[PDB]
Amino acid sequence: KHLSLTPELYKYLLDISLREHPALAALRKETSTMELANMQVAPEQAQFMQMLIRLTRAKKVLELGTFTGYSALAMSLALPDDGQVITCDINEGWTKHAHPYWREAKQEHKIKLRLGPALDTLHSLLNEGGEHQFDFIFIDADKTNYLNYYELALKLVTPKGLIAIDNIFWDGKVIDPNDTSGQTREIKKLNQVIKNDSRVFVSLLAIADGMFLVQPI
Amino acid sequence: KHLSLTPELYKYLLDISLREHPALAALRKETSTMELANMQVAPEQAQFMQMLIRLTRAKKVLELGTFTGYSALAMSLALPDDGQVITCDINEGWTKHAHPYWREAKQEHKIKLRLGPALDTLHSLLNEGGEHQFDFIFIDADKTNYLNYYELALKLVTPKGLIAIDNIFWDGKVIDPNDTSGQTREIKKLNQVIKNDSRVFVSLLAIADGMFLVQPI
């Protein structure tokens, strides 16, 4: 039998485990209405990624996507004083900066925002800082470059480092044949590349829109 | 907006992520019928705990439950060769020895089986083996003793170590107000203990029947 998560149970889950920092909760609550809040990682998704950072013993983290700045904050909160998180915001629509909350939580010095198309920001990061830089990489950028991002992330990650990729099941459109959009076309393609990939350890969690955890061997 | 794991989707999930060793597959096929297979941790969930053992950089692993020997094998596989995995089988009912399979893969020398009540086996390893011996502990034993197993776990796990608890939502029974059973009752009690536990870092995954992951400090 498969676990059907209901609103009442999700409420319970959150209650017994969500240990959210005020600036986070505030950043979240102040952007709930915002349409951007949807592309935003879930409270426990982020707390899980914090666990991951501790288990990685990460010093440098990288993320990509259209952000409110919530996942970037949570990430540095789980990072040590000397650590650093590079958030890449590809969003070119409406936003509000997250730095006020970052300051309030004492993280703006650990968070390095990089605006613009994720692809460019990642090659720049390669050029500048070399290949094995990040102990933890999170991918939630535009789906139609997911193949490029995966490959790049493989060059940017630490041997013991980890990579997380969101929306593996594009809402169940990766199992829907009548969907013709290039976004669900790229996800399906990437899921195949990984399946047949001999280069990494792998595990997929049915928690978000599906989250893939890959680690080089 | 919550992910309902559809059978068709669970197939896709397994299809793209599953990398189950030849011996494990075999083990699951025969123990499949036994209906002790319902207590056996699912394929994807075990590949996850393997990822956890690798992240953890573990050499010592502990399991509690009514096993078929599958998760003990999966764990042992993820461990190096100087690695140890101690599985505790509280099973009373019918069963079949898993060593024919632990031998197929050369894991025979890494798995130390321990039959009998879990409280005694945990106190035994505790009462002398020291503390902080295991880098990863997995609790899935009798529900009514869950509050206890938790306390022992915190003692036996190493710092930077990890404890995974299964059946955290007990099939939605954790919400039911008309539930008296000491099983769901003891689970609920535990979740509250974890909820207010300042000794650890927490994280609750909506996979399986819910999986809490707590770590020291």
Side-chain angles (χ1 to χ4, degrees), chain A residues 2 5-28 30-107 109-217, chain B residues 2-107 109-217:
Chain A
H2 296 111
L5 188 61
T6 72
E8 297 88 299
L9 188 56
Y10 180 65
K11 235 89 288 180
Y12 186 60
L13 181 160
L14 256 28
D15 185 32
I16 67 170
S17 75
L18 218 203
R19 272 138 82 132
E20 194 172 52
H21 181 290
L24 273 180
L27 197 167
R28 229 220 316 153
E30 257 265 54
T31 52
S32 325
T33 59
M34 220 158 167
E35 296 307 290
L36 233 190
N38 287 307
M39 359 255 270
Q40 253 32 54
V41 84
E44 11 68 13
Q45 243 59 77
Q47 177 158 159
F48 172 55
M49 296 193 291
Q50 284 190 139
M51 175 94 271
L52 299 170
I53 287 179
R54 303 157 187 158
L55 277 43
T56 294
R57 299 172 208 193
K59 285 289 164 295
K60 200 170 180 174
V61 168
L62 177 79
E63 52 154 33
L64 320 62
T66 70
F67 308 124
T68 52
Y70 179 102
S71 44
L73 178 59
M75 269 177 230
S76 77
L77 281 174
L79 278 180
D81 320 58
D82 57 318
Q84 184 194 315
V85 28
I86 293 183
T87 172
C88 308
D89 193 12
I90 69 173
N91 188 4
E92 38 188 283
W94 296 90
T95 28
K96 268 180 191 167
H97 301 304
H99 69 264
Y101 301 90
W102 293 345
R103 304 265 164 53
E104 171 189 335
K106 297 292 171 46
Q107 314 295 174
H109 64 292
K110 313 210 297 194
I111 303 170
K112 209 303 168 77
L113 181 69
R114 297 286 248 98
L115 297 164
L119 221 96
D120 301 79
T121 300
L122 304 196
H123 291 103
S124 150
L125 284 174
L126 261 185
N127 283 31
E128 303 312 299
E131 286 195 16
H132 304 180
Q133 283 180 287
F134 305 102
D135 297 277
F136 177 67
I137 301 178
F138 171 53
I139 309 173
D140 194 354
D142 55 326
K143 320 307 158 188
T144 61
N145 279 112
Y146 254 35
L147 242 300
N148 297 288
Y149 294 149
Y150 178 55
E151 292 299 314
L152 240 20
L154 289 173
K155 317 223 275 287
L156 286 179
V157 84
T158 278
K160 306 236 184 176
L162 180 77
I163 301 168
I165 301 89
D166 204 20
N167 311 101
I168 298 310
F169 320 135
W170 194 211
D171 185 50
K173 311 251 87 171
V174 279
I175 224 57
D176 183 39
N178 305 316
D179 193 323
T180 46
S181 58
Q183 297 138 67
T184 119
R185 172 198 174 71
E186 269 291 304
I187 307 298
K188 291 173 66 177
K189 283 191 184 173
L190 179 76
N191 287 352
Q192 228 56 54
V193 178
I194 294 176
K195 176 185 173 183
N196 310 149
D197 197 319
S198 63
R199 302 177 294 188
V200 296
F201 297 121
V202 154
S203 42
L204 170 62
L205 294 301
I207 43 176
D209 204 19
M211 187 171 272
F212 243 141
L213 295 181
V214 319
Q215 180 185 67
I217 59 175
Chain B
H2 291 158
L3 158 153
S4 59
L5 204 54
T6 253
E8 301 66 49
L9 188 61
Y10 183 55
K11 315 317 170 193
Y12 184 60
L13 189 169
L14 243 30
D15 180 71
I16 55 175
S17 64
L18 238 194
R19 257 125 108 140
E20 188 184 43
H21 181 295
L24 278 178
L27 200 172
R28 208 225 316 164
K29 295 156 182 171
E30 167 50 62
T31 66
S32 169
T33 63
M34 300 181 92
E35 86 167 344
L36 191 285
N38 301 70
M39 306 176 88
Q40 173 209 59
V41 32
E44 16 90 21
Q45 201 192 326
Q47 194 167 90
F48 173 50
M49 284 181 239
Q50 271 185 143
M51 178 90 279
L52 288 179
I53 293 167
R54 303 213 218 76
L55 269 37
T56 296
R57 297 176 187 170
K59 338 187 174 201
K60 291 291 298 151
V61 180
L62 178 57
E63 287 192 309
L64 296 76
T66 42
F67 308 121
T68 57
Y70 173 88
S71 42
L73 180 48
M75 269 173 222
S76 187
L77 288 162
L79 284 171
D81 242 54
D82 51 55
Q84 199 80 57
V85 30
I86 298 177
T87 171
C88 306
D89 191 9
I90 61 175
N91 209 341
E92 225 75 329
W94 306 84
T95 186
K96 278 191 277 302
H97 303 298
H99 67 261
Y101 304 94
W102 302 340
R103 263 189 292 90
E104 189 70 7
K106 276 63 77 289
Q107 318 298 166
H109 64 302
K110 298 199 297 187
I111 310 174
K112 302 304 107 186
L113 182 52
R114 301 287 249 94
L115 316 177
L119 299 305
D120 307 288
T121 307
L122 295 193
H123 274 101
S124 168
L125 316 164
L126 226 218
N127 288 16
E128 227 33 58
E131 290 187 349
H132 308 27
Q133 340 178 187
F134 309 104
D135 307 302
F136 178 65
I137 282 96
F138 173 51
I139 307 160
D140 193 350
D142 56 324
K143 278 52 215 180
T144 49
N145 267 119
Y146 256 33
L147 217 325
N148 288 316
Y149 295 137
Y150 179 63
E151 295 308 329
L152 279 317
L154 297 161
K155 295 201 161 194
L156 294 167
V157 80
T158 67
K160 300 193 209 290
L162 180 68
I163 296 73
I165 326 291
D166 201 12
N167 307 100
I168 297 295
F169 306 130
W170 196 231
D171 194 64
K173 296 284 90 64
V174 285
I175 287 174
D176 207 308
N178 304 304
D179 213 309
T180 11
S181 50
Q183 293 213 94
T184 109
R185 189 166 196 61
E186 256 282 318
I187 301 284
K188 300 194 224 185
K189 302 266 183 182
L190 171 64
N191 297 341
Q192 291 299 141
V193 175
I194 291 157
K195 182 192 177 180
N196 303 118
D197 202 307
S198 57
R199 304 171 274 176
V200 300
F201 283 137
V202 84
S203 177
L204 178 57
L205 277 51
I207 56 174
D209 199 25
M211 188 177 276
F212 248 135
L213 305 158
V214 305
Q215 91 159 182
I217 308 167

